[PDB]
């Protein structure tokens, strides 16, 4: 999974948050693009921009009316992939000042 899109129209007419985890770095922007189809494999009024089975990754995404808050954790698991019931806690990453209205989201895969 390369990352996420969050917004309302998800392309054109208004801003929509794009987050790409581009291998070495996170890359983030708020103007729209048509890209979706296959970025995971080898084989415009842009008013904000930012850069920064045995493993289970956990995230929380929140919009606090203002800002966009992200928490995460990286956890080891056995290959029983259905969320083994061992308790875990997620820690803050970022608190981005984006101010964008959001109702819908999508996954980059």
């Amino acid at each position: 999974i390369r990352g996420w899109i969050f917004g309302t129209t998800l392309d054109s007419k208004t801003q929509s948050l794009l987050i790409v985890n581009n291998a070495t770095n996170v890359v983030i922007k708020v103007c729209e693009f048509q890209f979706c189809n296959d970025p995971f494999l080898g084989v415009n009024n842009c008013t904000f921009e930012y850069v920064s089975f045995k493993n289970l990754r956990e995230f929380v995404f929140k919009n606090i009316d203002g800002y966009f808050k992200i928490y995460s954790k990286h956890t080891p698991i056995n290959l029983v992939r259905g969320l083994p019931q061992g308790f875990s806690a997620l820690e803050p990453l970022v608190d981005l000042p984006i101010g964008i209205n959001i109702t819908r989201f999508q996954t980059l895969l």
Binding site: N45, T47, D65, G66, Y67, G99, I100, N101
Partner: protein, 50 residues
């Protein structure tokens, strides 16, 4: 007149705190689905101080 400075006259709901919105769509005041109709039932919302 310096018309280059503008404000949104109305919106279908009030902003949430620090919600930022540059949308240029026609505000529907009445029954007409606007589609470029302006000045009655429908209005362009970005007014100027001039």
């Amino acid at each position: 007149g310096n018309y280059n400075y503008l404000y949104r006259l109305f919106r279908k709901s009030n902003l949430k705190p620090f919600e930022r919105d540059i949308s240029t769509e026609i505000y529907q005041a009445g029954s007409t689905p606007c589609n470029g109709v302006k000045g009655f039932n429908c209005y362009f919302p970005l007014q100027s101080y001039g």
